[PDB]
Structures are given as structure tokens and as C-alpha cells.
């Protein structure tokens, strides 16, 4: 049995050379996860790194969201409040206006107010009261969004009508019926084009935020996407090395086993 011991020896001495594959396999696969973890905190740390960013950047767009909301939600409730009161007209009014010889001051202002905000260059009686009474005119002042004015007009307005203590509702009423609704209206119409002047920095900086913040979104989403994924592929090592160390030793200990019995 001599040979036997010796082919034994030589055996275990097989055994214990693959035990170095085995053992140093594990410490790859250790490796390869250790790798991994050390872009998977990375990536973690990036992801609240984003997470907090978007917080701040979403805390401005709420606060110039409300600050438009209180912006249009002032000078818009007395718009709307003339834009009807434009179309509550009986033709009574209409043709009171409309076949007017020699008019008072304050219905040739009104009227003339109206065809500067809706662009008319022309301040000539005739063709103006022509122009009013239209089928498309009320249609035109009820689509009126006014957007549609340059910053120029404005003060022509303001400079030459609303400064002038005629441009005013009473008289402007008192005068014509029909001119006293659009003057409320081309009122509340100077008033909104003024707050736009306002707002129109504010949209076009929600827009810069919005869209980042979407973008940040999205980019960080792409990072917890990942994440997982690694804390997926790393789970499967995890789970693999276990197993392969329940291997190696359980070699390792037939190794000592055995010269424990050819001693």
C-alpha cells in the first residue's frame, strides 16, 4: 500500500493545486463585483446628487408659476367683463353710432382708440364709422387676443387717451351707449398687453426650467435604470461565489482528513 500512500500524496497534492484554482477563481468573481459596487455607489451617490438639483430647480418653477397665476389672475377678470359687454349691444346704440352726422368728443375718441389697437392707421370720420358698424368688427374685438400689440402702440395709447381725463367710461357712455363698452374693454385691453410685458419673460423662463428639469428627469431615471441593473448583475456573482465557497473547503477538508489517517 506504500504506492498507494504515495499516489494518495500526489492526489491530495492535485487537489490542493486546484484548490488554488477554485479559491482564486472566488477572488476574481470578488473582484469583478467589487468593480462593479464601486460603480454602483458612484452611480448612487450621482443619483441624489441629481435628485436634490431637480427638488431646487422645481421649488423656482412653482414659485414663478404662482407668480404668473397672481400676475394674469389681477389685470384678466376685467377683460373678459368687457369682452361681453361689447356683444350686449341693441342695435339701438349700434345705429346711433353708426349714422352719426357730427359726433360728440368722447364716442370719435372711443371709436378712435379701437381702430389704434386693432392697427388702423386711419383717423378719418367717415370710412372710421363705415369701419365700426362691420360684420366683422365685434368678431374681430371678441378674438382679440392681445398678444397682437407691438410696445409702441401702448404708449400712443396711454400717451394720447387714457392720460386725456375724457377717455373714461361715464362719459365715453353717457355719450354713446355703444362706445362706453369698448371703452371699458380697450381699458381692460391696455391693462392685460402692459402685464404681458411682465409675464412675457416669465414663460419664456419657465420654458429654460421646465425642459431641464424634464431633461434632469430623464437623466436621472437613465442612473437608477443603472443602478438596478447592477444591483442586478451583481446579485448574480453574490449568489454564485457563495455557492463556489461551499466548494473549496469542503475540498479542503478531505485534504486534512486524510493525512490525519496516514500519519
Given amino acids: 500500500t506504500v504506492d498507494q500512500v504515495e499516489e494518495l500524496r500526489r492526489d491530495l497534492r492535485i487537489k490542493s493545486q486546484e484548490l488554488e484554482v477554485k479559491n482564486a477563481a472566488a477572488n476574481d468573481k470578488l473582484k469583478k463585483m467589487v468593480k462593479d459596487q464601486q460603480e454602483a455607489e458612484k452611480k448612487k451617490v450621482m443619483s441624489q446628487e441629481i435628485q436634490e438639483q431637480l427638488h431646487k430647480q422645481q421649488e423656482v418653477i412653482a414659485d414663478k408659476q404662482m407668480s404668473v397665476k397672481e400676475d394674469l389672475d389681477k389685470v384678466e377678470p376685467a377683460v373678459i367683463e368687457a369682452q361681453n359687454a361689447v356683444k350686449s349691444i341693441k342695435k339701438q346704440h349700434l345705429v346711433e353710432v353708426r349714422s352719426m352726422a357730427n359726433p360728440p368728443a368722447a364716442v370719435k375718441l372711443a371709436l378712435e382708440s379701437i381702430c389704434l389697437l386693432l392697427g388702423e392707421s386711419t383717423t378719418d370720420w367717415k370710412q372710421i364709422r363705415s369701419i365700426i358698424m362691420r360684420e366683422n368688427f365685434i368678431p374681430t374685438i371678441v378674438n382679440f387676443s392681445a398678444e397682437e400689440i407691438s410696445d409702441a402702440i401702448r404708449e400712443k395709447m396711454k400717451k394720447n387717451y387714457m392720460s386725456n381725463p375724457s377717455y373714461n367710461y361715464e362719459i365715453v357712455n353717457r355719450a354713446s351707449l355703444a362706445c362706453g363698452p369698448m371703452v371699458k374693454w380697450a381699458i381692460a385691453q391696455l391693462n392685460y398687453a ?51 465557497i461551499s466548494e473549496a473547503q469542503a475540498i479542503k477538508a478531505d485534504l486534512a482528513a486524510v493525512e490525519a489517517k496516514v500519519n
Fill in 194 to 244: 402692459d402685464m404681458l410685458k411682465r409675464v412675457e419673460p416669465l414663460r419664456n423662463e419657465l420654458q429654460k426650467l421646465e425642459d431641464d428639469a424634464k431633461d434632469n428627469q430623464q437623466k436621472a431615471n437613465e442612473v437608477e435604470q443603472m443602478i438596478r441593473d447592477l444591483e442586478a448583475s451583481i446579485a448574480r456573482y453574490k449568489e454564485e461565489y457563495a455557492v463556489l
